[PDB]
Every structure is written in structure tokens, then in C-alpha cells.
Design an enzyme around this catalytic site. Sequence first.
Site, PDB file in Angstrom:
ATOM      1  N   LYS A  81      33.047  43.079  48.428  1.00  0.00           N
ATOM      2  CA  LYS A  81      32.919  41.986  47.444  1.00  0.00           C
ATOM      3  C   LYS A  81      31.496  42.058  46.909  1.00  0.00           C
ATOM      4  O   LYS A  81      30.589  42.424  47.667  1.00  0.00           O
ATOM      5  CB  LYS A  81      33.246  40.630  48.082  1.00  0.00           C
ATOM      6  CG  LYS A  81      33.466  39.479  47.106  1.00  0.00           C
ATOM      7  CD  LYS A  81      34.851  39.449  46.471  1.00  0.00           C
ATOM      8  CE  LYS A  81      35.780  38.379  47.012  1.00  0.00           C
ATOM      9  NZ  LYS A  81      37.004  38.254  46.181  1.00  0.00           N
ATOM     10  N   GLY A 181      47.101  21.124  42.936  1.00  0.00           N
ATOM     11  CA  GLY A 181      46.620  21.937  41.800  1.00  0.00           C
ATOM     12  C   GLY A 181      47.756  22.468  40.939  1.00  0.00           C
ATOM     13  O   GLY A 181      48.787  22.899  41.501  1.00  0.00           O
ATOM     14  N   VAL A 182      47.568  22.447  39.614  1.00  0.00           N
ATOM     15  CA  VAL A 182      48.551  22.940  38.603  1.00  0.00           C
ATOM     16  C   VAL A 182      47.823  23.859  37.607  1.00  0.00           C
ATOM     17  O   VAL A 182      48.131  23.778  36.406  1.00  0.00           O
ATOM     18  CB  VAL A 182      49.262  21.773  37.886  1.00  0.00           C
ATOM     19  CG1 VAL A 182      50.557  22.221  37.232  1.00  0.00           C
ATOM     20  CG2 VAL A 182      49.537  20.607  38.820  1.00  0.00           C
ATOM     21  N   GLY A 183      46.902  24.707  38.085  1.00  0.00           N
ATOM     22  CA  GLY A 183      46.310  25.806  37.295  1.00  0.00           C
ATOM     23  C   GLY A 183      47.382  26.786  36.847  1.00  0.00           C
ATOM     24  O   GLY A 183      48.575  26.491  37.080  1.00  0.00           O
ATOM     25  N   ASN A 184      46.997  27.912  36.236  1.00  0.00           N
ATOM     26  CA  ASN A 184      47.958  28.940  35.745  1.00  0.00           C
ATOM     27  C   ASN A 184      48.885  29.377  36.890  1.00  0.00           C
ATOM     28  O   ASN A 184      50.104  29.207  36.734  1.00  0.00           O
ATOM     29  CB  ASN A 184      47.258  30.143  35.106  1.00  0.00           C
ATOM     30  CG  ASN A 184      46.821  29.881  33.680  1.00  0.00           C
ATOM     31  OD1 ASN A 184      47.551  29.270  32.907  1.00  0.00           O
ATOM     32  ND2 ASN A 184      45.635  30.344  33.318  1.00  0.00           N
ATOM     33  N   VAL A 185      48.333  29.888  37.997  1.00  0.00           N
ATOM     34  CA  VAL A 185      49.111  30.474  39.135  1.00  0.00           C
ATOM     35  C   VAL A 185      50.118  29.434  39.644  1.00  0.00           C
ATOM     36  O   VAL A 185      51.291  29.801  39.829  1.00  0.00           O
ATOM     37  CB  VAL A 185      48.206  30.977  40.279  1.00  0.00           C
ATOM     38  CG1 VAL A 185      49.009  31.340  41.517  1.00  0.00           C
ATOM     39  CG2 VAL A 185      47.343  32.157  39.854  1.00  0.00           C
ATOM     40  N   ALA A 186      49.670  28.197  39.879  1.00  0.00           N
ATOM     41  CA  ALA A 186      50.500  27.082  40.397  1.00  0.00           C
ATOM     42  C   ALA A 186      51.648  26.809  39.420  1.00  0.00           C
ATOM     43  O   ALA A 186      52.810  26.815  39.860  1.00  0.00           O
ATOM     44  CB  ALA A 186      49.651  25.853  40.612  1.00  0.00           C
TER      45      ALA A 186
END
Length: 366
Positions: A81, A181-186
Site C-alpha cells: 500500500k 451507508g448507501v454509497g455506489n457499492v451499497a
Amino acid sequence: RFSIFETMAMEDYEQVVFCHDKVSGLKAIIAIHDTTLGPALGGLRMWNYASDEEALIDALRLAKGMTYKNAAAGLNLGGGKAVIIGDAKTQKSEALFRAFGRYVQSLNGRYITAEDVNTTVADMDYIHMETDFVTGVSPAFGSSGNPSPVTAYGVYRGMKAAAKEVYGTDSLGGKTVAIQGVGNVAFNLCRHLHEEGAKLIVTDINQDALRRAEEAFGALVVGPDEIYSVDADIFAPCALGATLNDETIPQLKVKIIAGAANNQLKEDRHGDMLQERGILYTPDFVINAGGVINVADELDGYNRERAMKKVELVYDAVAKVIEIAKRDHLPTYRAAEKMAEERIATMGSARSQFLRRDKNILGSRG
Ligand SMILES: [Ca+2]
Ligand SMILES: [Ca+2]
Ligand SMILES: [Ca+2]
Ligand SMILES: [Ca+2]
């Protein structure tokens, strides 16, 4: 107390590279943990660290994280990383990312970088000017490589697998899933879950995000602090990490955790608590691997169908962690760590006979 070398010794880190450029004011840490399986793949992450030490600790922590993520994901990649210290708002330049990419080229493909936190395909395209040891930048990944739905499918498939174990059936028909959470992935995990006929309780720090959700899936909205206490079968942390802790875990009425967030556990104890509380914790770095599997696929000429068919198998990977927890009488998260360490050890042995050229994931290394 913290001593770079005592940590490298205790944890078995291979390499930590500190990079500076004058004109760009670049301060970067590349951290490489274990490269038994191949080149170290890990996101470049830009952040306003309070001290050198804060940044090093984060770089190391996140590097060892990729070792397990990638090993378990069945990828021929090690744990690395990278990290730039500074304000993503004000200090991004061409020179910053070119100079960094040059220091990535300096390690001759021991580190492969990609977009992470506060870094973008635009930033990676500056890195690409100096090195081919960067991923998520090709026309093929540009065209039909939009990553969110693939991480989501990973999480979806992994949840299915966990459900099979506790409920006896991998059907999420008429199950209630609490979704932090309701981001893109969610949002995309919600879609697979609605289509299977599942009830969705959701929260987010963002209002426009919430209404898009209840509009499209008909999800019951709930307060950020309520989500843990809510009456549901599955908790799916998809916002922040350390969400499974002293405070939240006693609230949980669910039988499964299965979310997209990295580092769901605040501490390892919280792994063992979920254990004692009889809740099946499907570990972060197994279930959300879909993200890294997607960029890894580009290294071999990107193909979304092949990526999805490879992520489909997160189910099989979760099911193996469960089998290992029962068989070795271990808590899920420690079974996932074992599974990753077993694979590293196995392939270190199974490839320990001489060949004039060993095949690795770098096709035409540049
Ligand atoms: Ca310089
Ligand atoms: Ca300077
Ligand atoms: Ca870990
Ligand atoms: Ca990820």
C-alpha cells in the site's frame, strides 16, 4: 515506543520506501509486507496525516491488510500500500504523481499501484506516464470497467454463502438486511437484494442518497445511531470501518454481518465478541475482495465477464472460511487469516523447484 524495525520484525514486513520530490513537495510511503505470491498490489491513498508516524502506521496497517485480502482472494499478488502526506484539495500536481510513479518504477514491479482514497483515474494516468506498474487506467477498464457493481456482487455472493450456513438455504427471499451507508457499492448491493425479494433498512450521512434508495427499492430509512439496534437478519456495514465495536455489537439483533466496508472490526476482540454473541462475522477482506480482483484482472488484459465470473466465487471463499472456523474451532476472522496464511505457505512450497523462468502476473513487465 513505536520503532519502524521492531514492527517490521514482529509483523514480518519486507520493505518500506520513503520518497521525496522538491518541486512537487511529495512525501510518500510505499509499504510492502509479503510478496511470496507475487508483486505487491495496493491503492495509492492521499491524506493530511498529523505526523510522519501517523502515515507510516496507516501505510503498514493497510499493506499487511492487502497481503490477506489478495492471498484469500486467490490472487498471485503480495501485500503493499502507498500513501502521500498532504491536502488532496490543494497539493495534487502533475509533478506530484509523475515523481511518485517514478519511485514506483524504481521498485521494478514489486509495487503495483491503483486508485484508492483521494486518488482518481486522472491521478493514475500521471503515474502511468512514468511506470506500467499501475492498474485501473486502460481503455478496456475505462470503457466497461466501472468498479462499484463488482465489489457489490462480491459482497452479495459472500452474504448468500453466510446465509446457506446459518439458515440452511442461500435464498435471501423475505430476509431483512440492515444496510449502513448507501454509497455506489451499497446502492448496487441493495439492487441484487431487492431483486431477490429482501426487506431493506438503510441509513446514510447524505439525504439525496437516502431518498434515491427508498424511491428505487422502497427501503425503510432509519437514524445513523439506530441501524445496529434495528430488527433484521443481516447487518451490512458499507460506510465506515470500526463500526463493529464495544458500543454497537451488543445492540445487533442480526445472525450475520456481510458488508462492503474495509476494517469492519475496530479491534480483534470485536471479532471474538460477535463469536460469543453467536453472530456469523463474514470478514471484510474476504467479502469485499471484488474491488481488488477487478483491477488485478486488467494485468491480464481487462475482461469484465471474467472478473465477474471470478468474483462470483467469493461465495466459495466465504464457505471455506466457515468450514475452517468449524474444523479448527476458530472465530471466522481468525479462520480467514489462517486460510490466507495456509495459501501463502502452500504456494511458497509448491513452487520451490528451480525453473529458468517462473511465470508471474506481470505479463510484459515495463
Ligand atoms: Ca528530487
Ligand atoms: Ca519540499
Ligand atoms: Ca488484516
Ligand atoms: Ca476495497
